[PDB]
Amino acid sequence: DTSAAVPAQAVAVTGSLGDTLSSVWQTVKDGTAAATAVMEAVTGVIDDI
Amino acid sequence: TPWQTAFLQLLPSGLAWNKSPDSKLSALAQAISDVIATAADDARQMLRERFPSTSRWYLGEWESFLGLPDCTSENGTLSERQRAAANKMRMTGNLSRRFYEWLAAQYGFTVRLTDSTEGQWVTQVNIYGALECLLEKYKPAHQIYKFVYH
Amino acid sequence: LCDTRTAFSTWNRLAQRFERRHAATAGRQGTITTSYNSPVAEKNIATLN
């Protein structure tokens, strides 16, 4: 059943992507250009969505 | 090469296919099976990587797990780093002079813990032929050390 | 509590642990120090082991 095999793989791909993002994200503790630029990136992604 | 022969053996057997060592199938098999050969070589080298006494790729991870970077770890020699890691990983023993002589011998040096000269607690270490800091870090809590070179 | 994976290993370890005690308590059959021990106690220990 090829029609119903695409969502099953898509779910696993999304889960793996989320796990990778969670693992690779590193907390920055400063209030400098790094923190404000991370804020700009996140708010731009939210703006697009 | 054995890998190209294995790939050739995996092919169907018949009058059509030519598997002689000078045919085009045999020419292509080496180029195709070459990558998997390198992958298997890496997977075999992981067996050596398993120990920190011989680790090469994972020396940084081993040192971090062990908290290695300190006085005993020599300047840059990879062998010294591996030795230090392989000694700290199985570092365990008592406070006796015999054990301390054995410990100093395990790091490549050779010392003799002789009797005191001025007191009782202070013990004299004769170094014949990093060690000072290692001994001052792993010394017994109550005792004190004196160092004499020869 | 043992699954089919760990049953053999755990029972092997227990067998070795009990074998050590049984051999230690059975190797000392006749000795001038074993003469001091009470007989009923020795029987009650050997049977249990």
Binding site: - | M46, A141, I144 | -
Partner: protein, 356 residues
């Protein structure tokens, strides 16, 4: 450091061209290109399996099951969860015997059973001790949690109110805590009464958070360990705590081998709690807000918890970094601690009252 997919593709295509002279496998939509890509995919799959086979050699990067196996092999033992015990006030009609096994259930469904039979003839409310059955962090409750009776018993009213809350419930440790313990064990090798061994012994007891050991404390035969129990509010030790820590270092049983290990007989330890040495800083900040006050003081306490020990010195640069680390404030001028503060080993510096 596995090879990348593009690198594998390029290597396979180069090998194809080398083995078949006059060939250009990089041509678009061709059989040789398709074969090269398929082989690159297979090689990438194995390289990924190779990476997973690695990264489990050490517990630091290992997965959960391999971390548990490494802990079991290295000797670190997990501690199981605990039940929830508490006082239950049961009202009685006449003289009766409450057997061991009667169950009282909460409004949610959790049941608590009595483990020892009791006899009462007071014809009035009495108090007993009762323990749960779930043996988890859901066992403990609030201040006054009503709970009914499940198994009917002669001459006792069903409902029962507990005035003191149930407590003692907990949970099994996480693999992160097991890894932390194993990392501590590997990083600090155990000797017989070493300067790290005294620290780990004094830390093994409950409640304590940090401990330091001064070898040759007062002479050639004495070593001195001082510990600090931050978790409480006094954030310091009491004579009872000092006595019990000294007793634990003097003698305790080994969970692994079952024998008794501890400090050597000849030497003396003489554990003693440290003495507070407050330091009052003068800090000027242009915006005033209680949240900013709390942030500044919290930063200072974290700085002290990280980089201050008994017998150690504290430069003003540490304080200035701690105050400047606050994101909100605009000016952080420091006035009082211009000079270096030092203390003897018996007294530990502490961030006292703050002057703003």
């Amino acid at each position: 450091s596995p090879p990348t997919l593009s690198s594998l593709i390029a290597r396979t295509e180069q090998n194809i061209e080398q083995r078949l002279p006059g060939s250009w496998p990089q041509a678009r939509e061709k059989t040789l290109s398709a074969i090269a890509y398929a082989q690159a995919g297979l090689a990438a799959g194995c390289h990924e399996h190779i990476s997973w086979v690695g990264r489990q050699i050490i517990p630091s990067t290992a997965d959960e099951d391999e971390l548990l196996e490494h802990c079991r092999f290295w000797g670190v033992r997990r501690k199981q969860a605990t039940a929830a015990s508490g006082p239950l006030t049961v009202t009685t009609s006449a003289a009766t015997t409450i057997p061991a096994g009667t169950r009282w259930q909460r409004a949610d469904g959790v049941v608590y059973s009595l483990a020892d039979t009791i006899v009462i003839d007071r014809a009035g409310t009495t108090e007993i001790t009762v323990t749960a059955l779930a043996a988890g962090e859901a066992g403990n409750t609030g201040e006054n949690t009503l709970l009914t009776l499940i198994t009917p018993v002669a001459c006792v009213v069903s409902d029962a109110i507990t005035v003191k809350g149930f407590s003692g419930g907990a949970d099994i440790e996480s693999a992160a805590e097991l890894l932390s313990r194993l990392e501590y064990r590997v990083q600090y090798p155990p000797f017989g009464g070493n300067q790290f061994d005294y620290v780990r012994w004094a830390r093994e007891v409950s409640g304590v958070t940090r401990a330091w050991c001064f070898p040759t404390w007062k002479g050639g035969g004495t070593v001195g360990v001082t510990f600090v129990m931050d978790n409480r509010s006094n954030i310091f030790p009491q004579p009872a705590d000092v006595e019990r820590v000294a007793d634990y270092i003097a003698g305790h049983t080994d969970p692994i081998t079952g024998l008794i290990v501890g400090q050597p007989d000849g030497v003396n330890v003489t554990v003693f709690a440290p003495k507070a040495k407050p330091v009052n800083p003068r800090i000027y900040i242009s915006p005033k807000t209680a949240e900013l006050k709390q942030a500044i003081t919290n930063a200072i306490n974290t700085m002290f918890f990280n980089e201050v020990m008994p017998g150690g010195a504290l430069a003003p640069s540490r304080i200035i970094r701690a105050v400047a680390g606050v994101t909100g404030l605009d000016d952080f001028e420091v006035r009082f601690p211009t000079e270096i503060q030092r203390s003897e080993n018996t007294e530990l510096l502490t961030a006292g009252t703050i002057e703003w």
